[PDB]
Symmetry: C3
Subunit: 596 residues, 3 copies
Amino acid sequence: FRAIIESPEGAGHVGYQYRRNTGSTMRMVSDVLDERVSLWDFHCDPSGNVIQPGPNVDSRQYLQAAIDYVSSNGGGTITIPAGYTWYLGSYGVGGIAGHSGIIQLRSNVNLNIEGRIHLSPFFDLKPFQVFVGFDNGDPASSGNLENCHIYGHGVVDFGGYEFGASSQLRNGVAFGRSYNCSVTGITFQNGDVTWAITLGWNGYGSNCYVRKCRFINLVNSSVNADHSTVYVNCPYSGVESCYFSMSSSFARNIACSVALHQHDTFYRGSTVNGYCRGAYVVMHAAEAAGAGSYAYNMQVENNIAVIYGQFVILGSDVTATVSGHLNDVIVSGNIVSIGERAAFSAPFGAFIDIGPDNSGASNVQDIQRVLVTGNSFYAPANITDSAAITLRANLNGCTFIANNFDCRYMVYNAPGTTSPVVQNLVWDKSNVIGGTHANQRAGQNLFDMQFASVVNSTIEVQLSCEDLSMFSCILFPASCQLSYSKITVDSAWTKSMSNTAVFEGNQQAGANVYVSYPATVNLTSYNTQGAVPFFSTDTNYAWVTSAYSLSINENLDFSPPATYTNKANGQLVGVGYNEIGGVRSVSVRLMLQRQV
Amino acid sequence: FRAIIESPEGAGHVGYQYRRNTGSTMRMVSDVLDERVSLWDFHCDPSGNVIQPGPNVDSRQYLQAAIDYVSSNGGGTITIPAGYTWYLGSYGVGGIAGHSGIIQLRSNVNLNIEGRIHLSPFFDLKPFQVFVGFDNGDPASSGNLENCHIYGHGVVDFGGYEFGASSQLRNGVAFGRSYNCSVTGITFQNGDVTWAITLGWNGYGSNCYVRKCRFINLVNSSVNADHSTVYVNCPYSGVESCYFSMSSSFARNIACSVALHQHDTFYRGSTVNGYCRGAYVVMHAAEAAGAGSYAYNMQVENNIAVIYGQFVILGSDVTATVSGHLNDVIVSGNIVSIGERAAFSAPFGAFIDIGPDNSGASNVQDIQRVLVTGNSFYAPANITDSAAITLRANLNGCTFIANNFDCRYMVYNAPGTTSPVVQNLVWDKSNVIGGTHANQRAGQNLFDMQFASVVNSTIEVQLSCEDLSMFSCILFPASCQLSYSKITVDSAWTKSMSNTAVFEGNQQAGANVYVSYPATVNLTSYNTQGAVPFFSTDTNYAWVTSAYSLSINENLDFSPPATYTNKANGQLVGVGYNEIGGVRSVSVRLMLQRQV
Amino acid sequence: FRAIIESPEGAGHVGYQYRRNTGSTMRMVSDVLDERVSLWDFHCDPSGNVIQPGPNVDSRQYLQAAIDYVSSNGGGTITIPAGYTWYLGSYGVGGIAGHSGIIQLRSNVNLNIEGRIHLSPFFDLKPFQVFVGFDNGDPASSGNLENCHIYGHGVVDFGGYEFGASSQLRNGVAFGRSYNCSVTGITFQNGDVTWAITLGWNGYGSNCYVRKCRFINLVNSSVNADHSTVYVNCPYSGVESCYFSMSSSFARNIACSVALHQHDTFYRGSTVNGYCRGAYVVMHAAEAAGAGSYAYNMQVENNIAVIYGQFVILGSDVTATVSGHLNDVIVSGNIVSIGERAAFSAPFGAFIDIGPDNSGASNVQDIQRVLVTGNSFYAPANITDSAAITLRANLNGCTFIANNFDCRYMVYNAPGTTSPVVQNLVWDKSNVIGGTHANQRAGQNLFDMQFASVVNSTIEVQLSCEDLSMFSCILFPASCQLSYSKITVDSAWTKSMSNTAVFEGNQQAGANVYVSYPATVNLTSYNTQGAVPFFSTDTNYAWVTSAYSLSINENLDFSPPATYTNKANGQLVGVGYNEIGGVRSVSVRLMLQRQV
Ligand SMILES: CC(=O)N[C@@H]1[C@@H](O[C@H]2O[C@H](CO)[C@H](O[C@H]3O[C@H](CO[C@@H]4O[C@@H](C)[C@H](O)[C@@H](O)[C@H]4O)[C@@H](O)[C@H](O)[C@H]3O)[C@H](O[C@@H]3O[C@H](CO)[C@@H](O)[C@H](O)[C@H]3NC(C)=O)[C@H]2O)[C@H](O)[C@@H](CO[C@H]2O[C@H](CO)[C@@H](O)[C@H](O)[C@H]2O)O[C@@H]1O
Ligand SMILES: CC(=O)N[C@@H]1[C@@H](O[C@H]2O[C@H](CO)[C@H](O[C@H]3O[C@H](CO[C@@H]4O[C@@H](C)[C@H](O)[C@@H](O)[C@H]4O)[C@@H](O)[C@H](O)[C@H]3O)[C@H](O[C@@H]3O[C@H](CO)[C@@H](O)[C@H](O)[C@H]3NC(C)=O)[C@H]2O)[C@H](O)[C@@H](CO[C@H]2O[C@H](CO)[C@@H](O)[C@H](O)[C@H]2O)O[C@@H]1O
Ligand SMILES: CC(=O)N[C@@H]1[C@@H](O[C@H]2O[C@H](CO)[C@H](O[C@H]3O[C@H](CO[C@@H]4O[C@@H](C)[C@H](O)[C@@H](O)[C@H]4O)[C@@H](O)[C@H](O)[C@H]3O)[C@H](O[C@@H]3O[C@H](CO)[C@@H](O)[C@H](O)[C@H]3NC(C)=O)[C@H]2O)[C@H](O)[C@@H](CO[C@H]2O[C@H](CO)[C@@H](O)[C@H](O)[C@H]2O)O[C@@H]1O
Ligand code: NA
Ligand code: NA
Ligand code: NA
Ligand code: NA
Ligand code: NA
Ligand code: NA
Ligand code: NA
Ligand code: NA
Ligand code: NA
């Protein structure tokens, strides 16, 4: 009896009944202990003696044994205990070896991480993916991971190690072909990695989420090629209420917080600091296997960000046999700024970027039905390379309503680069243009329409303060065709501007172009006393359907017309009034209108 | 001693002190084991021998015994263990019997569901409510349920069984008259049910929530009368970050994700696919007992949906002695689409529906102070039955600002059906109208104002592309009175339209009607050289206060007036200029204006 | 052996191996029991006998012993068991004594509160802070608190006791200089306190959050000086999905739900009832030590509130050596109402308040780059003291887009009080003004511009119904300078108004003022048959650049001009048409325009 009690079966001989309730099960102590499981239950030597974790102990095989065993019973939750740091010091074996995997996750086996998991210097200068849900080296031949949740107040610490070579990959959690998996509460910190977490594989997976996690200092070297902290590669998945921070200079040039790469995905309520980019929203044709060729129902909302490059990047692309499409996107409620930096010191600052594909092509994209509403954006006055939208590839539609943009440019694309074909660009008059960059815009167009063509578009410019430094509010080079569009410049704060809207190819004459903008015009009258015509001296107004005075009349003896129409020779003409006769000559600020 | 140790009291004789700390309590093993409780502690036969769960074991009585016992100690949390499926195979007894109840919930007793709960085929073709918080067959005589939380990574599986008769009811969790209750993390799946979860009873309850749950395939037959996945029937309660999916055809015609039926309730951050409807926001007079006759502070925000019918349905109604009112509603940040379907194959597609009561009455409602802002809506081009708002019952106010609507109709109601009385309908010019349905609108009015009357309303139409197929942008039949309203049609993309705004009863003449829209007008001048009047040939412009040219003047020898007023006989009149004399005859596109 | 087994070391002699797995660690029962810890492990007398909690037992020393011990092992989670109420009955000692502290929190030691914690009447009429994370009486000399989480379904009950003196302070949780700390799930109730929770200290701290908590009835007496339920005094921190309720009359005059006082903080998805105020968003110079002098990236979104005073209060202030700045703020998606109350019975009702500092100064503030978008606000028709914005101190910018405001005033400041200097106030035309207060505005200006000066501002007034009671839509007293601004009043619903915009100092004449508004004007013509001038009888239109008719012409024999310009003497002049000669005299409603 004493022998049995002291044996490993001893708890199985000590009886227990819950709270002494006579109606409860007559169990043994070991049965109640068997209701929970921890790493300590597997962290032992071959004789079964517990081993203390630490920097000289490789915990990997013990944690794998625990996972494998719980998997064999239909699942459960393994605790990684608080008050200890559990080091990982070798690669895993089998199916995860193809992925540089350390631990293999298994279906229905959750990890409650309350302590700390650290990488040992075995991993210095090497690739690694700490937790891998694939079960095969070839993701296409992998089985699924289902019902796997990682959660707790604990920490995954990547040991500070730099990348050995840029071509290496490093990840925290790769769930694989992942269905109903999640990470909640965990701090990922102190690394040089490619991703912290990836969800799904090329569209295979569903209902994967990252919630209330922190990602701190996960890029630290010039070797690191690229970084996205969470990559969402399965539908019906997303990221909420997370915290992302970087301190490295390299992070400002390479790091993005989130990638949304399949339909019905979201990124919400998160705070970002120190990153180059906020989120990619992309349909890569190469990733369309599991959920189709369309990324739709994409949501970026209610985030807070200080970044150095672009907040949201939109794109789609093609392969030999598949074409990717991006539509039905909403970007709303986000408050974003470009952090303090020199002009041109990081990738071009933007709220929205329409980005060319990885080979630089701007003629592959199929992006449409995007709504950008109720956001704020700010860039400091010195940051020349700051835009509401950098529109650098073909765009099939994007709608801006009720945003507040306070940066150098509203719409921009660099000249002599890409020549996007633009359709359905809608800039509603309810977009408020801030004044931080007033006086900085010498030689620049606020809306610099450096496109191949623009159709079915609306640009309603409304200033909120003066900026007489700018060359124009909106300019179309002669190379940009413009048709079936509405372009207006409100007169407020424009009285002193030489140029308001500029059409370098006279494109505002087009049959289905609807415009209005202010201009100064010299007129001369006939000598007749009484009702008397005034005519413009210049003949460049053949396209004008009406014009009206924006100037007061300082004269007593006459008045110019209040409103004008045109004549076939391109003159404006209106009927004013000479109280006394005489030829009159005036210069008047007019609102020129065409079909509006 | 050996006897005591092996007895059910044995753990109560084995001493323990936490971590060997001399300052800690000298306890017994059983005391520490008694800190937790699971189903295994009650899942035993009359001799106390544990019973293994499975498809041939009815776990109901054991789970009820556990709940009842924990309730007797002031509460706690019962775990339903992982790695097992726990079948339910009989009805409960007592107070829950009136509700077809299986398990009775009790105050302060939480369920941590980590394993799976399944319904056995005893329930096939029968009604059932799996977990019931009422304690009486008659909800009016029921006590409350307080401080009851269901949570975990587990699953409630309804066994796939179809309904036996349409009149039956089936539910997952009915919390009853429920205060500070919640469901978090749970997957509900594989059923034909009426609701998954209901919160509160006829306004009695408070602080009930459904968070991070999944609802998958909960309608599967033509027998199922109706389905709402979560019904919120108590104030200060709501649904967040949930996932709802249906695959059944029947679901597309009957199923709604959420019902918000009392004040201060919300539905946020959720994803919906495969449902007919997104949310009801309703004050039923029949449900006003617990929290009053007003549903106010209703919030639907930041959701993602693919549906087949209507996204948000607003309503209120009356009984013999109570009148229900709906006000102070916000619908914002939602991105919604009508899924691919044939026209008229499901209930009429809409972003907002103002729905008549369950008896079809449209003259009972009191709905006002609703704000619909910053949403996107899309329906495929073939779906004739798609509208921003189907306004089918009396409306006392609804405000649209800064939405993007891309569907067949903006405002619609079917002719010869209901004749709503409409007040305070506000459609701000910042609503962007998409072009998906361009060329599909032969015989149709974009805003089809099929109402009894419209007052204190604003419709500011702004197109973003051409659609010459449409009969008109906005039309008022002669039966619709119109007063104290503003109706404008911006000219952009309208030059080629025969009809822009149409007032079949000439209602735009009303004293307090403020309108503007484009029209073509034939004018003739007098022969006089010099300043010369032009007059419209038609006499239907008695209501016009000013008009201005939207056309260029192709002539050299004359110009028509830039602006016009009217005359008592209904002609327009303006002063142009004949450089040379002669009678002139022109056809000009004008912007007609009345009091604007 | 029997002796050892019955001793406190007995569990340490009973062997256990998890699930009888031969590959698992050979442990002892005590090792598995040592994986968890509860208050029962420390709630014992000097002989180690467990003590039952209750109203006559002071649990404080036991809970402190537990915290101190777990702290010594590197942390963990202490459970406060369900089914018991644990009373606190004395003050703590040492470093927390300076803060009236009860319990001292320690780093890495979490509290899972499942039971109830109550204050004993020892605390009646006394100050207290229940849980304190400072370790020194002087916060400046305090160490940090890190990785401390309080969570569970339990309750902190403040015993109902009133404050003894107004100068006293009372708090639930003061995390101190707090990094990665949180409270989740907890109900705070039944008190008279200053705060429930405070996060950070004068900018020191990071990543602190309050989530899914309830705060119920935490002000109950006239002694209570002031109350903010959560004070956020560290960056990268915030409040989400919480519930706040008060029933006291005193709460309506003193209580605020949240204070956001450092950068990158948020308040989201919460419901508030019974409070005076929603949130302060403030940079106090006195609090700038830890995180700088700027509060930026401040987010208030998607909340539901019934309040009696002001929803969001903005401010910044200075000390002898530091100046505070507030910028980059977003207020969005909130649905707010002033509860039913008499006019002037609580602090002045407002959606936004620009508040003077604690000494009443209005010339210290530096508030700019604020976006207020997509919110709804309502106040009942009797509440004279209700405004979209009470602008009572210097403002450097605030932007309103696409809100729905339904209250007495849009912009207000009391005359003869403060004279704010206002820059960059932007009120977009997409703000919908509701009609609840129609007919109540005798003697009042809808936009009452009671400022020292206004510059670089935009006010675009758009009515949605008539209110002929109001004195004017917008009025500028002669003392308010106005320059480089745009002020427009849309004509809809204004035909019958005597005054629309009123410039008591004729400020609309300014060189860079852009205005338009309706006015009635008497004109007389010359007798000439044919094209004939009409001239205003009054000479106050020297500032007008154009005007156009808003009236029909009831005459056959003539027509007045459709459009007018001015003359140096301040007359308007236009060219109409006399079909038959004669002097004409008409009174016409015109749209007066200046530089627009
Ligand atoms: C860091 C990041 O996410 N960057 C974004 C771009 O991602 C693309 O480059 C990445 C570089 O790290 C990834 O490529 C690398 O990894 C591939 C996957 O590794 C293999 O497969 C894994 C499952 C195994 O575990 C590994 O062992 C390994 O075998 C590898 O094939 C590539 O050779 C390597 O360079 C990234 O690849 C994706 O990774 C995810 C997450 O792990 C995975 O689920 C996918 O299966 C895998 N996709 C593919 C196709 O393999 C790769 O996509 C990203 O392209 C870019 C988007 O912006 C550009 O394109 C837009 C659309 O045209 C355009 O609008 C925009 O302007 C462009 O800049 O954003 C980051 O740069
Ligand atoms: C499925 C659903 O929720 N449908 C919505 C409509 O709900 C209405 O019909 C339902 C059909 O299932 C419910 O009625 C059924 O259930 C009643 C309640 O069951 C009894 O009481 C329970 C507490 C017990 O546990 C049960 O054992 C049983 O005794 C029953 O009385 C009815 O006879 C039966 O048909 C639904 O009833 C509500 O259910 C909730 C949740 O359980 C409960 O808290 C309420 O007490 C109960 N209410 C009432 C009055 O009994 C019933 O409301 C819903 O009416 C509709 C809203 O849209 C329409 O009305 C709008 C406002 O006028 C109008 O704008 C719109 O256009 C209309 O279509 O939406 C779904 O159809
Ligand atoms: C209840 C509340 O939060 N009210 C808001 C105002 O807060 C200011 O008054 C409070 C009154 O309770 C606090 O002052 C009180 O407490 C101070 C702190 O206590 C000391 O330090 C603690 C760390 C210890 O634990 C305590 O033992 C004690 O030693 C004390 O010094 C004061 O004497 C006392 O009156 C509040 O003080 C802040 O408290 C937080 C949270 O505990 C703490 O983190 C800070 O360190 C501490 N700050 C300071 C400077 O000490 C104090 O700030 C708040 O000023 C106001 C904002 O609105 C006004 O100002 C705006 C900006 O100019 C203006 O726009 C607006 O119109 C104004 O009305 O809002 C509430 O009234
Ligand atoms: Na690989
Ligand atoms: Na769009
Ligand atoms: Na071109
Ligand atoms: Na019933
Ligand atoms: Na409204
Ligand atoms: Na009628
Ligand atoms: Na103190
Ligand atoms: Na702003
Ligand atoms: Na002044």
